[PDB]
Structure formats: C-alpha cells, structure tokens
Amino acid sequence: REQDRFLPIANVSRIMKKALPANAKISKDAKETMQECVSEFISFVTGEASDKCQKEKRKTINGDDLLWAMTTLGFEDYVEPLKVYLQRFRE
Amino acid sequence: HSLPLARIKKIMKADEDVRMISAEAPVVFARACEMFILELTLRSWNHTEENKRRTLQKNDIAAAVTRTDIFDFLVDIVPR
C-alpha cells in the first residue's frame, strides 16, 4: 500500500534482527506487520500526550509529554531509560 | 538515529489535534520505537520457538499481542 505513513521497512527490519538469534528468519509479512505496530505505537502515545496538552491549553508536545503519556499507557519500563537517553541528547 | 525523525513527525502530525512538536519529541520516539520493536519482536519470537519454527511470522506477532496487557491497542491491527 502506501509506505509514506509508516516508518521505513529497512530500519524496522534491521531493528527486529538485532533482537533475534543470528539464525532467525523473519517473514516479509512480519516485517510489514511490525511496521504497522510500531507506527500505531507512535499514534497511541501521541494521542494521549496531545490530549493532555489539550487539557492544559498548551499547544506544543514536549519530550516530557511523551514520557508522561508512556507512563499513563503502561510503558513505564521505557521511561527511565528514555530519560537517560534524553539527557545524553541535551548535553 | 535508527529511525527518521521526519517520518516520526509525519506520523505524529496525522493526528488532527497535534499542533507544534518540540524537536525533542521525535528524538524521544526514535529511541522509544526501538525499544518497542525490540520488545515486541522478542515476545513474538518466544511464540516462534514455542512452535519450534525458525521464521518469525505474522501469527507470532498476533500471538505476542494477546499475551501482554500493554499491547491491547494492537489487537485490531493484528487479529487471530
């Protein structure tokens, strides 16, 4: 279909393989499916952050808003690693 | 970055309510998306090894989704 609205397959696939044993194969179907799951992750997290900005009459989704939304939707295991990453980015 | 920030922004912007986006937000997502892809592929692979197959297939991803709560939002994207 249209791959304009998805993250590129070559980046997603290469990310899948590093998680997997070297002998692993991945169907072209799974690559495509994982492409859609990860793109839905962005929308899901963005929806929540956008809702909170909307409640607070703020017009910008900041980094904190994404982290706050990840915790709200149950991805708190990601949030501390992400903070550390974000500091290495700001320094 | 592993994934392109411009595409990430693109995805964020399909949401009608999104206005401006801090430049840190695609950066947070690039890393966060990685972690998501790693964790979902690993849980999918548990099913692949369970069936003692060597190919990760779509049905493995479908399986991983039902087995963990934080992934409910994905049950319509990959049913079965």
UniProtKB/TrEMBL annotation, chain A:
The organism's place on the tree of life at top rank: Eukaryota
Domain Transcription factor CBF/NF-Y/archaeal histone: 6-70
TM helices/strands, residue ranges: none
Places the protein is found: Nucleus
Signal peptide (UniProt feature, chain positions): none
Family stated for the protein in its record: Belongs to the NFYB/HAP3 subunit family.
Name the UniProt record assigns to this protein: (thale cress) hypothetical protein
Residues of the full protein shown: 26 to 116 of 190
UniProtKB/TrEMBL annotation, chain B:
Span of domain Core Histone H2A/H2B/H3: 1-65
Compartments in which it is found: Nucleus
Family membership noted in the UniProt record: Belongs to the NFYC/HAP5 subunit family.
Protein known as: (thale cress) hypothetical protein
Record organism: Arabidopsis thaliana (Mouse-ear cress)
